[PDB]
Amino acid sequence: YDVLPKEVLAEVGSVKLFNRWSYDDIEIRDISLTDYIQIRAPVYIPHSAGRYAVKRFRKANCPIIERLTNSLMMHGRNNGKKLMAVRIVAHAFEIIHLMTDQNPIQVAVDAIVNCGPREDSTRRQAVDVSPLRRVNQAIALLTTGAREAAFRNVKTIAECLAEELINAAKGSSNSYAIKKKDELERVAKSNR
């Protein structure tokens, strides 16, 4: 060792996020959303010093766990606080792996694919939705569901983020972001 703990030396081989979960066997389930949801470059914790607002379509190259963090610092998490958001991502992924025994990052990526809407309503006209907007609206409805259901209850944003991300990965009729996808698509069907 140079100086490294037993957990890190224990998993020193590939790249693991939160030193537990590799990227090397996770898969998109939308060829539309594949080139934007980033599993290509490997990153260890979501905290990184990347400028993904220099010009458009950089945030289709930043990693999506950093996008779930960055969306988790909104007004319900008091915008300056970053390490609060990667801590909620940590406890949420642990609650996913203990509730699920599946790879929690695959739970999150299939959650995002299963949550972003494909048709919306131009405010009436009904248009197809961009895939970058599909990723953005996906992540925003996920964290919005996490806060709006973890608002007054004892259940923390860790637990509720993990429940919306698991049920979002299932595509169930329980999850807030699934319900908003079906409501927006329902309005686009009714209007056209």
């Binding site: 140079d2 100086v3 490294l4 890190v8 020193v12 939160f18 260890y44 914790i45 905290h47």
Partner: protein
């Protein structure tokens, strides 16, 4: 007549020196070891050059880091920049030149902010 390399690292205001000499594997940051600095949730970002480059590249050197200024985050980026530049610089001057270029390739294929710090100016749009 020793094998000594001085190296800096930067962020917003955190500046860090690191001296890398012929040693036996230790990295000590302000006296305390590297696995003890920078409160727990960012030590993966401390370790990122180590488990890119492999500890076998580090089992012959000693890295001594002093960090001043900035907040916690900027001290972390200053440390990891000083680690990466320290080993690239030691392998520049003492072991062969091929291994430098291989280490620069590994660090640059990961993230160039481990070597070149790009401080932000502002954008007065036209």
């Amino acid at each position: 007549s020793v094998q000594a390399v001085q190296v800096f690292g930067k962020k917003k205001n955190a500046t860090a020196v690191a001296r890398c000499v012929q040693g036996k594997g230790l990295i000590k940051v302000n006296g305390k070891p590297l696995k003890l600095f920078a409160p727990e949730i960012l030590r993966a970002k401390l370790y990122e050059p180590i488990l890119i480059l492999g500890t076998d590249k580090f089992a012959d050197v000693d890295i001594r880091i002093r960090v001043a200024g900035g907040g916690h985050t900027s001290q972390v980026y200053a440390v990891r920049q000083a680690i990466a530049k320290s080993i690239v610089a030691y392998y520049a001057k003492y072991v062969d030149e091929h291994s430098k270029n291989l280490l620069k390739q590994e660090l640059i294929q990961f993230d160039r902010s481990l070597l070149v710090a790009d401080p932000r100016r502002c954008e007065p749009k036209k």
